[PDB]
A = this chain, B = another copy of it.
Amino acid sequence: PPPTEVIQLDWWKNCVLYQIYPRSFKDSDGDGIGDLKGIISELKHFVDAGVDAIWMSPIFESPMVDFGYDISNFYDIHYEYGTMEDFEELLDKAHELGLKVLLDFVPNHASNESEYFIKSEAREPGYENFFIWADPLPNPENPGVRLPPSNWVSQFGGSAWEWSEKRQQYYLHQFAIQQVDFDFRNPAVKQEMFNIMKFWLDKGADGFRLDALPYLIEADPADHEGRYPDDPLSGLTQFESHQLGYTIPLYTKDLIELYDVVYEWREFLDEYNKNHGGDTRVVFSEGYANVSMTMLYYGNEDGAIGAHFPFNFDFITDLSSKSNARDFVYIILRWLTYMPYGGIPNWVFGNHDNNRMPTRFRHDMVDGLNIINMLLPGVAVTYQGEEIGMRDGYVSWEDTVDIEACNRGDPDTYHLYSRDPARTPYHWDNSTSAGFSTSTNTWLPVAEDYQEINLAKQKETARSHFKNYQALTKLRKQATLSHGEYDIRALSDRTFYLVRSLPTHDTYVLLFNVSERRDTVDLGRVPHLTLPATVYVSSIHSARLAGHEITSSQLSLEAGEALVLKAQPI
């Protein structure tokens, strides 16, 4: 039977999306700080890797308190990264190579060094109500003893309320003291968000990652007898009143009103795509929330439409080296069971806020994890370094610069909080500072294992994480991966299968031993697998090379061993 034609999908429905952390990708000018000229110089890397789309962490003007998530000017480039002209060059060259480019949009908060905040604190007309400003809580017990409006706790520790001597009021910060929460009930704030997105779409951005959306809106004091209501206490004894986890964020996170803002953004974007034509511009939302609250980002039962997708963080939050094959299957099934019909699935294995994929799992699991990412239906999301199996870098207390570690931690505890280990410079090669920089003085220390783990080494050697990555992004061109069904089950506590099948097209089968022990399985239990079949990709430690023929229905897999098999059509 001739292989059926499939209707090609819009680019965003099955792209490989790569997150760049610009400060740590490529330093072009020897200051130990990654920059836009650095990115331009290695845009060819994304073509070589089989990446369709890049999203950059924030590159806008910022005092760098939260390394770019504290934005003082939403309309220009951070000087350490380069100039507006460098950004326009990046977009032109990325587009020439057929890549899509997404920017990190940070709508929840602005730098306390923004004109928005300076004018708001000064009560200039039109800015007075731009942020959440609150009087001290009345103190009938001791009148005029200053109390915060409520018990709300910052994501970076301490009160979410900061006193302004100038304004004689508290402002809200869910993040750092320097990150001031906008009032999303103010129509002028909502207009300014459209102004920012229009500016960057007009420059030719292909869309946005939407930062920290669960924290957009907090309880209206009009609904709580003219005060900000206290969040419920957790009652967990390990947390004092200044420590994140002391409260349950009932009045400060996942408010139903936030989704109305997201649906308004999507309406604006749909209108922009209709009026401008060309490639669909998209929004992908960031929010760590339960399944119900996560799926509302897609849209609601009234038929409102939201983000093209909310990020799926399940491989960060719900799986690790403690997981067995049944855990892998049960967590993979969660997105696919709960996602609305017509929704596009996505898979995230890492980001700049979490430990690196091989550290959360094991070094011998890198290939199997990248195979899951690329072989599951929908969109594969890769964090800078996953394509070469980068591990967390050692960062001392002395070298730690993450506000979350510095605010929540001390020399003895900082490792529980710090995001710095996942932000160490990218391993290009075995030259000074792993080819990230010509300087030995990098903004974070280069990981100690860059001699063993670097892109140039993996491009030369016969078998590598990066060559596996390339083989997998290439496989995504096949109709079976773009349009095929999926079947996923555990064969044992150690090994699971994932079958992509499509009548008249080749069958692809992942077999993954996620355990630390050898496992023998009966391939006769795998649906749509006829033997003999051919190894397409194997873990770097597999006895099987690509082109190896599987003939026996009895298969032994070593600890961490993953195979992709190519089998005849069904």
A residues bordering B, Cβ < 8 Å?
A: 233, 235-237, 301, 326, 329-330, 333-334, 337-338, 340-341, 489-493
Contacts and interface: CB of A to CB of B under 8 A. Distances in A.
Nearest to A233: B237
Contacts of A329: 337
Contacts of A340: 493
B341 A330 contact: no
Nearest to A492: B341
Contact of A326 (B337, B490, B493): B337
Given A301-B493, A326-B337, A341-B492, 8 more contacts: A233-B237, A235-B236, A235-B237, A326-B338, A330-B333, A330-B337, A333-B333, A337-B489
A333 B330 CA distance: 8
12 contacts: A235-B236, A235-B237, A301-B493, A329-B337, A330-B333, A330-B337, A330-B338, A333-B333, A337-B489, A337-B490, A340-B493, A341-B492
A334 B341 contact: no
Q: In the complex this chain forms, how many copies of it are found? A: 2
A333 B337 contact: yes
Nearest to A331: B337
A491 B235 CA distance: 40
A340 B493 CA distance: 8
Given A233-B237, A235-B235, A237-B233, A330 B326 contact: no
Contacts of A489: 337
A306 to B, nearest CB: 16
Ordered nearest first, which 8 A-B pairs have the shortest CB separation?
A235-B235, A330-B337, A326-B338, A329-B337, A326-B337, A235-B237, A333-B333, A235-B236
Contacts of A235: 235-237
A326 B338 CA distance: 6
Contacts of A334: 330
A337 B337 CA distance: 14
Contacts of A338: 326, 330
